[model samples]
Target: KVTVDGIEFPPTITPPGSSKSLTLLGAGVRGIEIEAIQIKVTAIGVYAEPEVIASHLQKWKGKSASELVEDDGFFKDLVQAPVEKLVKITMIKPLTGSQYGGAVEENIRDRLKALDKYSEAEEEALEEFREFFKTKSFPKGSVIFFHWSSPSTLQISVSTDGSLPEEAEATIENANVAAALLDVFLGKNSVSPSTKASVAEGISALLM
Candidate 1:
């Protein structure tokens, strides 16, 4: 059983192509022990060599967690668990409750800037994205997922309880922009820093 703080998750996360499966690298719960709102991240993936991966994980002890997604050289056999899959992030929390008005787009732009430095051309598209997400709010009991796929695709799904999931997708034709967007979060600015840190920690735990 794959357990994080005694809670069961997908014990074996299957990847595309190989019948060989992936296992939990680690997991963590974000926030204070008593906090009502937090995110839990479970990292699951494969390594080319078990011993090598084990040693890498061992080195993490007494050190800060490393990013779960590493370069292809370090993760030759890696297949992230949530690839092309809709893994839920939030269960029932509101994504944003603020009024949809001025500077919302700028806030998004700022957040994206913080995450990555895209080119001037990509900035143009970001304006449209800012407008698209400005008024969007996930209701109570809503669930959200982010998925990545080949041919440079990103898909986000938001499902309110008792209804079909709504989706927003992006496919990057530019190689440079696609590489940058591949690892960034679509809702990076919408979430609180604490929540983002928690989620990062949990995912990092798996790598260790």
Candidate 2:
């Protein structure tokens, strides 16, 4: 298990319907300010095929962690890679689905809008993605999975236990939906810079 902010994530995971096992590239935490104090909200784990190093990220190889952190373009290139990636989110603070979903919905839309990628279809996909979380609540330890099974599809799944679903609860077909969502935590103006930097540390080590 990979430990981040006291949460343990399985070091490897194969997304539903995918045969390739993704290695855990890094771990980090998400926090939100509440009542003048920031609260830890979630622990995130990034998993991707180990081959991405040689296949897509060779250009950034040998760069230091600070270099990786300073340049978000490398992460942009990462999002474009044709490989399976999984984002495991484990909640550390309880939040209603509406709260969580609405926040993410706003971020995803904003990210897509900034990229000029949000259109009618992307808007509809956002609703589908938001509704799943709207009808439920996530207590501490609840898990959410964002499985990038293909370049154009993202399968979302929820779990109360540590196990992942064999099938996704919902699948978003729009490329921008998945891409924009990834930007929330992995992009330049991300919500979790600590997590992003931690991932940079991991990638730097892997490049060695």
Candidate 3:
């Protein structure tokens, strides 16, 4: 339900707990200051990071649109949306000066490269992560992880033959597909230990 120049165009929607990118048309016009670009949201259900247009603009204070431009939810909310409403956006002008073509580009590149390094570190961490995979599928409610049963002990249970040992059958193969869903619900710090250490050491300092 997004439009451009009176013509609606396709827009990418980011689901809750996820992020997506969109181009704001008529942005970066000459004489427009970085802080003047605003994206007005007209849809009820649509939500965006930097919840308000002004906040989104503030993050670009001295930067030019073409220079390493990106939206990082800086002023945006971590999540945006309404029950079922679509989002519409319009760019308001008070555009002051032109984009800072040269320095902005260089600065943005350096910043992106630093981010790339962190990405590399994350990948390296995952490479060392080990887990078993099973191709065969089973009905729901068949598999499960350890559940707390008492202060002194944790327990994992599964449906089994009355005579079969439930404790002995916990396998990647025998686990129920439903039990595996817990994987989606379970969240933890994915940034590797090494990455965390690097951040602690100031490796994540801002780009020049």
Q: Candidate 3 — which residues are off by over 4 angstroms?
A: 1-47, 50-59, 68-208
Cα miss at 181, model 3 (Å)?
Answer: 21
Query: What are the per-residue Cα lDDT tens digits for candidate 3 across 87-204?
Result: 2222222111121112222332343345453244333322221111122122221221222112212122322111212241222221122122111111121112221222112211
Which of 1 and 2 is the better model by lDDT? 2
Tens-digit lDDT track of model 1 for 86-172: 233333324552332123334545545765766675575555444545655656444333344442443434444623343343332
Candidate 2 lDDT over 153-206, as tens digits, reads 988888776667787888889888888888888887777888788788878878
Listed per candidate, the RMSD to the true structure in angstroms reads 8.5, 1.6, 21.4
Please list all clashing residue pairs in model 1, or write none if there are none.
25-206, 26-206
How does model 2 fare in lDDT? 0.84
Specify the poorest-scoring 10-residue window by lDDT in model 2.
49-58
Q: What's the TM-score of each model vs. the native?
A: 0.42, 0.93, 0.17
Worst 10 residues of 1 by lDDT: 41-50
- Per-candidate Cα lDDT values, in order, are 0.37, 0.84, 0.24
Off by over 4 Å in 1: 1-87, 97-116, 162-208
- Candidate 1 global CA lDDT score: 0.37
Q: Model 2 Cα displacement at 120 (Å)?
A: 0.5
Candidate achieving higher lDDT, 1 or 3 = 1
